[PDB]
Design a protein around this nucleic acid. Sequence first.
RNA 1: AGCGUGUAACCCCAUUCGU
Lengths: 141, 114, 102, 53
Amino acid sequence: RLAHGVRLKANKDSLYKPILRQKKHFNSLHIPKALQKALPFKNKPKTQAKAGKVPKDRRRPAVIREPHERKILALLDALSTVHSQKMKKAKEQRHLHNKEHFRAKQKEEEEKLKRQKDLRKKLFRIQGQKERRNQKSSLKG
Amino acid sequence: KKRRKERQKTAGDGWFGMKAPEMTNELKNDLKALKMRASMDPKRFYKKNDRDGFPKYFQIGTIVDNPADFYHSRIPKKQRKRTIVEELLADSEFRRYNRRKYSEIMAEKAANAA
Amino acid sequence: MAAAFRKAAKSRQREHRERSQPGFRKHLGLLEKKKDYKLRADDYRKKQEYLKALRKKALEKNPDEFYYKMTRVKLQDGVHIIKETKEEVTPEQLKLMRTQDV
Amino acid sequence: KIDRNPRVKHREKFRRAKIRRRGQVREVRKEEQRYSGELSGIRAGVKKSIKLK
RNA sequence: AGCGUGUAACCCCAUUCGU
């Protein structure tokens, strides 16, 4: 290649690039209307109606807010959104750290049962020899 | 029954007869802000709240000025407000941090939705 | 010194890399791997087991079953919709709302 | 790089050990500034005394 | 009409043609 003028050309498909995937959402399960009727009353799904419609004469005008309290009300919701996220994030950190601790614990009882059977093993033989004498006197009493 | 009802209107003699104030939308707004004080300052950390609900007996007031703390600890009268929520509305440091955190969550959530 | 052998082997930490969708088929979407397929595979398996559980319960359903909730609620196309409760306003109350609105 | 010098490695272990101890116990501090509060909550339900019997 | 949640013809009324 150096002697001639041949130059390396790299395939674009063969090169490695970041994938940059996005997480996947799935539709909710749909229960056929025939199945819902066939289901027993205890297992029947029960839902609430929307009932959005209201008659013109019955409906009332909405509250009109002054700009001052809207500043206060928007501030509280923004503070509530941040606080709710912080507690939920801290919950997972507590959940994760407790998980390895329980996993760390289970290793010792697996080791602990190993010394349990070996120590009991030497004592077990002495008990077994006593049971032999009970065979000869089993018939007599 | 009537003597029970009279005794629940006050905290009791152990705390010199504190009364339970009537709950309003301005009093409830202040108590909700106090519960969520952990997220106001990223560099300040607080202990867990004593109770999940609101206290039954409480009172609202302001700290008296002291002549000795003229420079060390005193807020000018122009900066003082009537309520806790209005104090949060006024200071620039809390507003600047909160809007950045809130926008970040929504920008994250917009990507989450898509 | 089995651990010493393993430590020498793991001196290099470059891992094998993932290949992407070919360019001439880019409009189709991302090339799914085993981790991507497992998400949609477990989702379908989750729903089918639930539908089989629902269908089996329909077999031993007793048409003569009775509940006191049945007296005040009627089915709509077989679906049990809980209708919202009424307000039961009175004419005197109705006249007060309209005066407050104006 | 910290493994190259054993003396500075022991220095870092002590610094972490004091940080980890802060969770277990409270460090003593003087009143270098006028008292203005706890900087945190005051929990009235926690009882940290030791019973004698 | 009736089966089928993975990011209607046929029929019917009338119009035209024609061994």
